Structures are given as structure tokens and as C-alpha cells.
Amino acid sequence: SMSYTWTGALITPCAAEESKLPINPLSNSLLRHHNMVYATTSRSASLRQKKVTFDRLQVLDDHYRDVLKEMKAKASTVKAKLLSIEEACKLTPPHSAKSKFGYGAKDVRNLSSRAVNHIRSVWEDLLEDTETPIDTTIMAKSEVFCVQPGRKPARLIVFPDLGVRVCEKMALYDVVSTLPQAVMGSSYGFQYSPKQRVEFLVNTWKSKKCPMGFSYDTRCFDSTVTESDIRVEESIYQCCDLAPEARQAIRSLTERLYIGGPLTNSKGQNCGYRRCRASGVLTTSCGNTLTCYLKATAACRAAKLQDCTMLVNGDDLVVICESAGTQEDAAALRAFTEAMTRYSAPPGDPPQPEYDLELITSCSSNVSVAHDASGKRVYYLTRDPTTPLARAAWETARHTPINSWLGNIIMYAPTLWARMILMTHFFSILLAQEQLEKALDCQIYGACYSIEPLDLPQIIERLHGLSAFTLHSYSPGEINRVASCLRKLGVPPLRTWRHRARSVRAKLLSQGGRAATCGRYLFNWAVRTKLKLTPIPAASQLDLSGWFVAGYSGGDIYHS
């Protein structure tokens, strides 16, 4: 069927939308080429719609079915807990889109009578009405990018009302947080922290006689997800031991919301109909991961690839297997893409066999190596800094709900560009505004957390280890990329940053407290007189577990 059907009504903005980076005295320190930074707007919606709209082709086979049963069998071991209206409400981000029923995020978190009561009525309805399609809202998402040799059309987000959202949590939060793991084990990418992911990729890579791996980019994954896929997805959830209410709610949500439903723009006008995956629902991350793993694992058997190892992150896939030779590999890969196309997962860019792990890009990032104080190699996860930087500039010129810059300092603390550009630039700004202890909200694997900037040394040591503060001698390839990128965006030369770092470090130390620990550990690269960085107390007294359990991107989750 058609992934989409449009009435003709326009995907309307919900207010004034900014596309150009505003000129702020602070933005220029980071990059001078501000006209290269742009935020997507609803004005490009039409372009997007044309690309995500199309008829799907899906042919299932014996391999698909075999793998499915293997996954169901494992799911069978799971027992899911129904969440209480209270627990579910506490998971709602304080800035989630208000309900069209006289209550918003605050009320929900404040267990407000109106909020709690509508949510109850919504839940009741999910238990009685097993058919009526639930209304969803469609918006053009605003995201910042750097123009590439033209621009990207806004992505489209579809989500149900706040009421519905809380009910989703009630019925599926425990499932989407534990099932993926139970079904895919070490293949579930969200169980890993950046360091653990690298560990998994390197271990998996060395365990091969002659390793070969590729990244498989699926063309607009969400729109390739079919009614069948989503029902196969539910069949897996139905294998869990569930409370009657939770079970009915999963069945009703599947038929009324997940398989598709009406689309309404911000003006309350009917826009069309969705017959594929919505981006703004709780099962998006879990469902795409399950669906992508199922298809790839089956495709691999079909393509006769040898000893495949999947690493799935929603719609993101990276496969590492036993090479059977250059030609054979190239052929098995094409066979794999065809198996995937039949399964309704056509490729965006054709996949390419990689024989060098650093060249494989998965989850918009790759594995690279540098050296610690001792001089021993240390592997870390990095990525092209273009978007992180572009956004960092946007987040400097304007106040923003989430802070990608902070989320990036955390996930990419070991990286050359994160330590030289982001830490320097942002700490220097925080001092200028006397706001080091002010908690900031940022997202890790889609879920929001409030983090105090001054706890960055502990966090980093905990997730990455002390080497993150001493890494040097990066790879030629990594150095080249960062350099090319920094020059492209017009970012101050190395020398300009070292000077700014020496100054920020000094300013920080002369404050003691947690602000001093930041100066010693984070900017230890600036000074010639290195420091014997020892373990940090607060670092061991940390529990960053919830951080890397599952994916919730689009699920509207917030961890208090």
C-alpha cells in the first residue's frame, strides 16, 4: 500500500520558524561561515513528502519466517510490567507538547486532576475501542545542519496526543526497555555506552579470521515499515507475559495507532493518511530495531554471508562477518541488498564492503584509535564533527530546549574535536555568564536528562576512563577529517583554541571546587606541564546505568 496519502492540506508550522543562524557575538568565536548553518523549516515539507511517499513491495520467505520464530521464542521468556498512571506521568518530559484537552506536561508531572483524569479516560477507551483510528499530528521538524556541496528537506514527525502518549508508556515502557535486549542480546546497540559499543565492534572485528563489514543505509526506513511489519512486531510483544489490560492496550494501539491513521497539521486540518511507521511513538525505536534486525538476519542467510554479526540501533545497521574473498564478498553484499529489498528495505546508497573498521560508519559514527599518556593505543568512538559543530553554533546564538553540544561532549569526550572545540568554547561561555552549576537538559539515545556541567569530569571518567583526558596522537584519517571540517566551517586554527583553553583552564582552577576539577582534567591538553590525572572520587560513586539501556528516540521519554 501507499506509505502515505495526502489530502492536499499543507504541513503547517506551529509558529515563526528560523532558518538562518542569527549573528550573535558568541557564535563567531566558534565558526565564521555562519551562512553555511541552517535550520530546516516546514517550507521544505513538500520536498520531503514526495520522498517518503511511495508504494511498498514486500515478499516474505522461509528465512524471514525462521528468524521471526527464533525472535519470538526468545521474547517468550520476557515478563512485562504494567506501569501506573503515576510512574508513566513521571516519565513525561516537562516540555512535551501539551494536550489538546486542557493540560500539558507540567500538569501531567504534577499528577494534576485534569491531566490524570483524561489519561484515565484515554486508557479506558484503549481497552474498549479496538478499532477507531487515533488522531495524530504531523509537523516538519526543525534541525540544524551545515550546507553540503544543497540543503536537506525537513524531516516529518508524527505523534499522538499527550493523553495517548502517557498510555503508551503505561502499556509498553517496560517492554520496549527490556524486550529488544532479550531478543537480540549483544546485537542491541542501545545497551552500550560509546566505550562499550567500540568494545563490541572491536571484539567482534578481531574474532574474525578475515573480517569484512558494511553499514546498511535503508532509504527512509520508517516509510518502508509495512502494516505487516508492525503486526509482526506486535506478535513479538504478545509473546511477553502481560497483564490483560496491557495486552489489550498493545493490540488496540497496534490497530488504531501504530499501523497508521489520519494525519492532522497544526491548523487542525486533515492532511492525509499514514500506512507506515510514525516517528513520534514509544515503539518507534524498539520497533525499527526489531524490524531491522529481523530483516537483516534473514537477508544474511539468504545472501549466504558467512558468520554475520549484527549491531542494530533503530533503523541503523552495521554487519560484521567472515570474508570469503573480495569478489565473493561484493556478490554476497548485492545478494543481501536484494533480500533486503524483497523484505521492503531498499538501500539509500548501495552498501560497500569495508576491510578497515575505521572506515565503517554506523550510527553516524566510527571507531578510531589514539594513544594515552603511556603511549598505548586506545580505541574510542568518533564522528564527523560538521553537524555537532553547526548545531553548537546554533545553540550558542539561540536558547534551545535540548543541548546537543552537551550531549556531544558526553558521548564524544575522547574525540579531538570535542575536547578542543566544544569544551573550550562552552566552558568559556559558561564562565562569562557565571553558569557552571546550572543543570542543562540533553539527550542520550533519544531520552532526556538534566546534567550539571561541573559533573563532566566524573561522567567522562566513568563512561570513558581517564584516558579520555590524555589521548593524543590521533590517526591521520581522523586528523584530516577534523581539519578539513574545521576549515570548511571557518573555525579558528589550533593555536587560537589552545590559547583560549589555557585561559579558560586558568580561570577555572582559580575557583577550586568542582570548577577546578574541570580545569585540571578537561583542559590538561593545553599546558606543557601535564598533570598526573588520578581517579576522581565522585566518578566511582556514579550510576550511569539508565543512560544506556534502550532507545527512546521519538518516544517522548524523560529520565528524572
Ligand X SMILES: O=c1ncn(Cc2c(F)cc(F)cc2F)c2ccc(Oc3cccc(-c4ccccn4)c3C(F)(F)F)cc12
Q: What is the contact surface with ligand X in residues (CB under 6 A)?
A: 416, 419-420, 471-474, 479, 482-483, 486-487, 491, 493-494, 498, 525
Q: Residue 82 touches which of Mg ion, ligand X, none (CB < 5 to 8 A by kind)?
A: none
Minimum distance from residue 371 beta carbon to ligand X (Å)? 8
Residue 221 or 426: the one with the smaller Cβ distance to Mg ion is 221
Residue 283 or 365: the one with the smaller Cβ distance to ligand X is 365
Alpha helices of 351-489 — where are they, by DSSP H?
A: 386-397, 404-411, 416-417, 423-432, 456-464, 476-488
Residue 249 or 491: the one with the smaller Cβ distance to ligand X is 491
Neighbours of 353 (CB within 10 A): 17
**514-521-550-129 Cα dihedral, nearest 10 degrees:** 40
Q: Residue 191 touches which of ligand X, Mg ion, none (CB < 5 to 8 A by kind)?
A: Mg ion
Q: Residue 123 touches which of ligand X, Mg ion, none (CB < 5 to 8 A by kind)?
A: none
What radius of gyration do the chain's Cα atoms show?
Answer: 24
Binding site for Mg ion (CB under 5 A): 191, 218, 221, 548
Query: Residue 316, annotated ligand binder?
Result: yes
Q: Residue 491 touches which of ligand X, Mg ion, none (CB < 5 to 8 A by kind)?
A: ligand X
Query: Residue 315, annotated ligand binder?
Result: yes
Q: Residue 548 touches which of ligand X, Mg ion, none (CB < 5 to 8 A by kind)?
A: Mg ion
Strand boundaries in 233-329, DSSP class E: 261-264, 270-274, 306-313, 316-322
- Please classify residue 59 by burial: count the beta carbons closer than 10 Å to its beta carbon, then call 0-12 exposed, 13-18 middle and 19+ buried: exposed
Which helix (H) or strand (E) segment holds residue 378: the answer is strand 377-382
Residue 170 or 299: the one with the smaller Cβ distance to Mg ion is 299
- DSSP three-state, residue 155: coil
- Please classify residue 408 by burial: count the beta carbons closer than 10 Å to its beta carbon, then call 0-12 exposed, 13-18 middle and 19+ buried: buried
Residue 108 or 317: the one with the smaller Cβ distance to Mg ion is 317
Q: Residue 482 touches which of ligand X, Mg ion, none (CB < 5 to 8 A by kind)?
A: ligand X
- Rounded to whole angstroms, how far apart are CA atoms 279 and 269? 20
Cα end-to-end span (Å), the chain? 41
Residue 414 or 554: the one with the smaller Cβ distance to ligand X is 414
Query: Residue 135, annotated ligand binder?
Result: no
Cα separations (Å) of 269 from 6, 200, 262? 12, 47, 10
Alpha helices of 304-455 — where are they, by DSSP H?
A: 326-342, 386-397, 404-411, 416-417, 423-432
- Rounded to whole angstroms, how far apart are CA atoms 405 and 392? 5
Minimum distance from residue 188 beta carbon to Mg ion (Å)? 9
Grid cell 557552571 — which residue?
436
Minimum distance from residue 468 beta carbon to ligand X (Å)? 10
Minimum distance from residue 508 beta carbon to Mg ion (Å)? 32
Q: Residue 525 touches which of Mg ion, ligand X, none (CB < 5 to 8 A by kind)?
A: ligand X
Q: Residue 221 touches which of ligand X, Mg ion, none (CB < 5 to 8 A by kind)?
A: Mg ion
Minimum distance from residue 299 beta carbon to Mg ion (Å)? 16
Question: What residue is closest to ligand X based on CB?
Answer: 419
Minimum distance from residue 70 beta carbon to Mg ion (Å)? 23
Residues comprising the chain, all counted: 560
CB 313 within 8 A of CB 299: no
Hey, what's the cell of 414?
575522547
Minimum distance from residue 420 beta carbon to ligand X (Å)? 4
Residue 183 or 482: the one with the smaller Cβ distance to ligand X is 482
Minimum distance from residue 430 beta carbon to ligand X (Å)? 18
Residue 51 or 438: the one with the smaller Cβ distance to Mg ion is 51
Binding-site positions for Mg(2+) read 217, 315-316
Binding-site positions read 217, 315-316
